[PDB]
RNA sequence: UGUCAGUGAGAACAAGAAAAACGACUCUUGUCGGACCUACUUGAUCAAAAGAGUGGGAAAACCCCGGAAUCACGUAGACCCACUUGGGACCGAGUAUUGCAAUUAUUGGUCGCGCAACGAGGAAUGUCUCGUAGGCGCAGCUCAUCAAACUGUGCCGAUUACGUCC
């Protein structure tokens, strides 16, 4: 492993591959974007970036944790049931992305459902995160 | 469900860990090896 | 000044530029405690002025940041 | 492969008479003896209302069992295992295994 | 004949509905109806279900077909043999006057009281 | 001149806000429908609703509301689906609410049993 | 509601405890696998609910035996001092799941109504001094099926007092 948490994985490993991936297309954009991504919304899926805060991160989780997928990988999914029926709030996940995200890894920086690196492209291209921000970073 | 050491089916059936001893209460009907110490 | 305001207007922005350096401590809150526009885009209003150096940023952070007269 | 002996019992001082004492017979005598330290001891906890009616202070109990699982290991006895498992007869719920 | 109804039920009048079978009916209608029909297919009662058709054949009344009562509140109202009138079970009430059209795919029960709310 | 301004959409004044979907809910909709917002030809948010027929192109939005089945957009967001006397109806708004209700206001409330009488 | 704060995203990270076996099939000179869970993949060239196949376990094996809430976050997110984008309770339409039988039983689901209540709430009154109070989540329990309940484990974790007897 190598990916995530070596550059600050929370907010300084995300925006940089995001820019690069939208600038030249790579990952899935399949219809289903509008549909509920996180439990019991009263709003739309998000204000902007419906399924473009997702894809590399959903590779990252499975990478460093070795073959967490489809039921384990929603482990680092979310759901609080933040609106509820006046009972004690409980955790959930929405399966929608699981299918698409186990498809993903066969292209771009990972190989297979057993081996999750190639040259580990994301790491190498993320070495310029530290050097210079692309967001006007506070710490750079 | 139903019980096998009564036929009452009411006054509550234990089926926890595959035993019934609450249609004949376990305080009265001990020697199952349980003890209370804490 | 006036109590309610979504608005983008000539007056809005022209007033803004004069009022911002007046205070010794500038936050998104106090600009909408003048009430000229809502707290919401009052935030953005300060950012892209501070970026052009009408203000001094204090915190290495945004949102719950504060600012000062430059 | 290597044969192991797990002895599962409700009570201590039944299993004790098995492991310590009667493994001496298999210690280097016919096979070699690798002692680890026995597996974690489960509790079976049950909670029973004391009162047989709805008027009390709504009291309850805590009843517990110990489950002692005593594991010691050997290095491949075959046909010798017959001796090993015929040794305890000293208490009920003494059960032994062979791989 | 001696049955009088109006449906207009998913755009379908009396004629198209009784042309369709119960099998094709449930593909249109309620989640409930599907499950009941599927698992009740083996036996729905021979003679009760018979008598609902039999009373239709009978004549010399303009009144809806009179048919033997039920103790069952669990039986569906089918598109076929509709307007067949039975005493819907309750321990005080039997109603022949809560069987009308626009009740297909709905239970025979959910009727004949069970409480009289007062005050 | 504007830039928070009342809007007639059911011939009913509803005041603007500085967010489009949130204000639009008063017209008989909700957020989760207005993921159609992206395809309503102003997917932008943090925008006035005095922006009607200028930067919102109101007429566009008012088509999506009425039939989203002309558009390709997923019809899992429909308010009514496969009614008991008709097919699907794409939305619930205005007088079109009342129509469906009345039919089942006589039927439903008949029901007798525990929960039946509670609904009655 | 501004002391999760309301809808969005991402990060790091927990502990007891539950589970399996039918004279039902097959197997022989005296007899083996199906009512438990979880893994993995199809379930997205197009939703959720939900379908099915492969794989392991009698548990320190169950895939890392243990994870997503309280929390962290300026990613320069969105809302922003309103009964709203704060809250749900009523109400109608659809569908799948469970079962010997459902009659909102189903409910982890869609999407309406929210502009229905209610703005810390008179008199009165409850109980705790430390890892406690308070806040938060998970499992067990009951058992066709449902936990705002009960029982147990864990997480975040104070203010005041340490006195008197009115």
Distance CA A89, CA A80 (A): 7
> Do F66 and F83 share a domain, yes or no?
no
Q: Mapping DSSP to helix (H, G, I), strand (E, B) and coil, where does residue D99 land?
A: coil
Tell me the residue range of the domain where F79 lies.
75-120
Distance CA B11, CA B8 (A): 7
Q: Is the dihedral of CA F100, F101, F106, F112 positive or negative?
A: positive
**Domains annotated on chain D, with CATH:** 1-99 (3.30.70.600)
Distance CA A59, CA A102 (A): 9
Name the closest nucleotide to A135, judged by C1' and CA: G76
Distance CA A79, CA A36 (A): 11
Structure tokens at D48: 């029973």
How far does the CA of B17 sit from the C1' of G143, in Å? 13
Rounded to a whole number of angstroms, the distance from the CA of C9 to the nearest CA of chain F is 8
- Phi, psi dihedrals of residue C18, rounded to the nearest 5°: -80, -40
In this structure, the number of other CB atoms found within 10 A of the CB of residue A58 comes to 24
Q: Which nucleotides of G are covered by protein (CB under 7 A)?
A: 2, 6-13, 16-21, 38-50, 60, 64, 67-70, 72-81, 84-99, 101-106, 108-115, 136-144, 147-152
> Do F20 and F66 share a domain, yes or no?
yes
Distance CA E13, CA E19 (A): 10
Element (H, E) at D71: strand D68-74
Checking A2-6 for CB contacts under 8 A at 24+ apart, the result is A2/A64, A2/A117, A2/A120, A2/A123, A3/A59, A3/A60, A3/A63, A3/A64, A3/A120, A3/A122, A3/A123, A4/A57, A4/A60, A4/A61, A4/A63, A4/A64, A5/A64, A6/A123
Q: What is the resolution of this structure in A?
A: 4.0
What are C56's strand-pairing partners?
Answer: C68
Enumerate neighbours of C (3 or more CB pairs within 8 A).
A, F
> Do F92 and F67 share a domain, yes or no?
no
Structure tokens at A138: 């506070």
The residue assigned the tokens 């001891």 is: D41
Distance CA F11, CA F22 (A): 19
What are B33's strand-pairing partners?
Answer: none
* Among chain A residues 54-83, those with CB within 7 Å of any atom of strand G: 54, 57-58, 60-61, 64-80, 82-83
> Do F67 and F82 share a domain, yes or no?
no
> Do F42 and F89 share a domain, yes or no?
no
DSSP states of D9-49? ESSTTTSHHHHHHHTGGGSSSSS-EE--------EEEE---
Distance CA B23, CA A37 (A): 49
> Do F99 and F63 share a domain, yes or no?
no
> Do F60 and F80 share a domain, yes or no?
no
Q: How many domains does chain F have?
A: 2
Are the beta carbons of F16 and F6 closer than 8 angstroms?
yes
Q: What distance lies between CA F55 and its chain's CA centroid?
A: 21
For an interface test with A, the pick among F23, F33, F35 (most A C-beta atoms closer than 10 Å) comes out as: F35
Are the beta carbons of E97 and E83 closer than 8 angstroms?
no
> Do F53 and F102 share a domain, yes or no?
no
> Do F29 and F67 share a domain, yes or no?
yes
Structure tokens at D96: 């032994």
Distance CA C3, CA C26 (A): 19
> Do F13 and F64 share a domain, yes or no?
yes
Question: Does the beta carbon of E13 lie under 8 angstroms from any beta carbon of chain F?
Answer: no
E5 backbone φψ class: left, alpha, beta (φ>0; ψ -120 to 50): beta
Are the beta carbons of A67 and A113 closer than 8 angstroms?
yes
Q: Mapping DSSP to helix (H, G, I), strand (E, B) and coil, where does residue F65 land?
A: helix
What are C57's strand-pairing partners?
Answer: C67
Q: How was this structure determined?
A: cryo-EM
Q: Is the dihedral of CA F70, F75, F77, F83 positive or negative?
A: positive
Q: Mapping DSSP to helix (H, G, I), strand (E, B) and coil, where does residue F19 land?
A: coil
Choose among E8, E117, E29, E39: nearest CA to E78: E29
DSSP states of F79-97? SS-S-SSSS------TTHH
> Do F70 and F86 share a domain, yes or no?
no
Question: Most distant CA pair in chain D: distance in Å?
Answer: 65
Which distant-in-sequence residues (6+ apart) come within 8 Å of D54 by Cβ? Answer: none
DSSP states of C6-19? ----HHHHHHHHHH
Q: What distance lies between CA E52 and its chain's CA centroid?
A: 9
């Amino acid at each position: 492993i190598r990916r995530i948490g070596k550059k600050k994985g929370a907010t300084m490993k995300d925006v940089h591959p995001w820019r690069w991936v939208k600038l030249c297309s790579q990952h899935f954009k399949q219809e289903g974007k509008l549909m509920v991504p996180n439990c019991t919304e009263i709003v739309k899926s998000s204000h902007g970036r419906e399924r473009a805060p997702q894809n590399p991160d959903w590779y990252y989780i499975r990478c460093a944790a070795i073959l967490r997928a489809v039921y384990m990988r929603p482990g680092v999914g979310y759901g609080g049931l933040s609106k509820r029926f006046s009972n004690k709030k409980n955790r959930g996940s929405r399966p929608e992305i699981t299918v698409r995200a186990s498809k993903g890894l066969l292209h771009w920086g990972c190989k297979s459902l057993t081996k999750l690196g190639l040259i580990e492209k994301c790491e190498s291209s993320g070495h310029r995160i530290t050097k210079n921000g692309r967001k006007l970073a506070d710490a750079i | 469900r139903h019980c096998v050491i009564c036929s009452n089916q009411k006054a509550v059936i234990r089926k926890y860990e595959l035993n019934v001893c609450r249609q004949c209460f376990r305080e009265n009907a001990a020697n199952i090896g349980f003890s209370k110490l804490r | 000044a006036l109590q309610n305001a979504v608005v983008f207007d000539k007056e809005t922005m022209d007033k803004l530029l004069s009022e911002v350096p007046k205070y010794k401590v500038i936050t998104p809150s106090i600009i909408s405690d003048r009430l000229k526009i809502s707290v919401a885009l009052a935030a953005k209003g300060l950012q892209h002025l501070c970026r052009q150096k009408l203000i001094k940023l204090v915190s290495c952070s945004s949102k719950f940041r504060l600012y000062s007269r430059v | 492969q290597r044969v192991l002996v797990k002895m599962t019992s409700r009570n201590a001082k039944a299993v004790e008479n098995v492991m310590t004492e009667l493994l001496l017979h298999a210690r280097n005598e016919k096979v070699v003896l690798r002692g680890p330290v026995r597996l974690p001891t489960r509790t079976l906890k049950v909670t029973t209302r004391k009162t047989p009616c709805g008027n009390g202070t709504n009291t309850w109990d805590t009843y517990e069992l110990k489950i002692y699982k005593r594991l010691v290991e050997l290095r491949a006895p075959t046909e010798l295992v017959k001796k090993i498992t015929s040794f305890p007869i000293d208490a009920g719920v003494d059960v032994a295994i062979t791989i | 004949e001696r049955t009088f109804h109006k449906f207009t039920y998913r755009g379908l009048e009396i004629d198209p509905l009784l042309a369709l079978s119960e099998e094709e009916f449930k593909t249109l209608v309620h989640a409930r109806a599907r499950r009941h029909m599927n698992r009740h297919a083996n036996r729905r009662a021979p003679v009760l279900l018979k008598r609902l058709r039999e009373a239709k054949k009978d004549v010399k009344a303009g009144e809806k077909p009179r048919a033997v009562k039920t103790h069952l509140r669990d039986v569906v109202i089918t598109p076929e043999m509709v307007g067949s009138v039975v005493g819907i079970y309750n321990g005080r009430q039997f109603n022949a006057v809560e069987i009308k059209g626009e009740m297909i795919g709905h239970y025979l029960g959910e009727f004949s009281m069970t409480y009289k709310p007062v005050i | 001149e504007q830039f928070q301004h009342i809007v007639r959409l059911l011939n009913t004044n509803v005041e603007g806000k500085r967010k489009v979907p949130f204000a639009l809910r008063m017209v008989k909709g909700v957020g989760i429908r207005f993921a159609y917002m992206v395809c309503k030809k102003a997917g932008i948010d943090v925008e006035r609703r005095a922006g009607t027929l200028t930067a919102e192109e109101l007429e566009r939005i008012s088509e999506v509301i009425a039939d989203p089945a002309k558009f390709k957009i997923p019809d899992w967001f429909l308010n009514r689906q496969r009614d008991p006397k008709t097919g699907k109806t794409e939305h619930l708004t205005s007088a079109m609410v009342d129509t469906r209700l009345r039919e089942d206001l006589e039927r439903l409330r008949k029901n007798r049993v525990h929960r039946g009488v509670r609904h009655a």
